[PDB]
UniProtKB/Swiss-Prot annotation:
Superkingdom of origin organism: Bacteria
Keyword Repeat attributed: yes
Cystine pairs: none
InterPro entries: DUF1508, UPF0339_domain, YegP-like_sf
UniProt source species: Shewanella oneidensis (strain ATCC 700550 / JCM 31522 / CIP 106686 / LMG 19005 / NCIMB 14063 / MR-1)
Sequence ranges of the Sequence repeats: 10-58, 61-109
Name assigned to this protein: UPF0339 protein SO_3888
Amino acid sequence: MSGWYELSKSSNDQFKFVLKAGNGEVILTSELYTGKSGAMNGIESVQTNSPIEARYAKEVAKNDKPYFNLKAANHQIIGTSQMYSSTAARDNGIKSVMENGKTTTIKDLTLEHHHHHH
């Protein structure tokens, strides 16, 4: 488990959490949740989905851009990855995601004024 979760607030007060591989490099970026309950519960969902590969969604853009999304049991979009360069980068990323996506290290940047990035 080399990575961790960071939840941050957007200009609309909407919350989005980012999963980092280990060195700080972000592998998963979730979209704007209108409520923290959905974001955090989304993280716990990812923890249960992490060992269950049947929950993934692997896609490649027409410009040969490999990426992947993560769905919960109700088929909702809880996680979304950033366009990688090589196909190998994507699948190696997934291996990291499975390892760290099941971590309990969660940082709240919404309540405290730690505005890292918009």
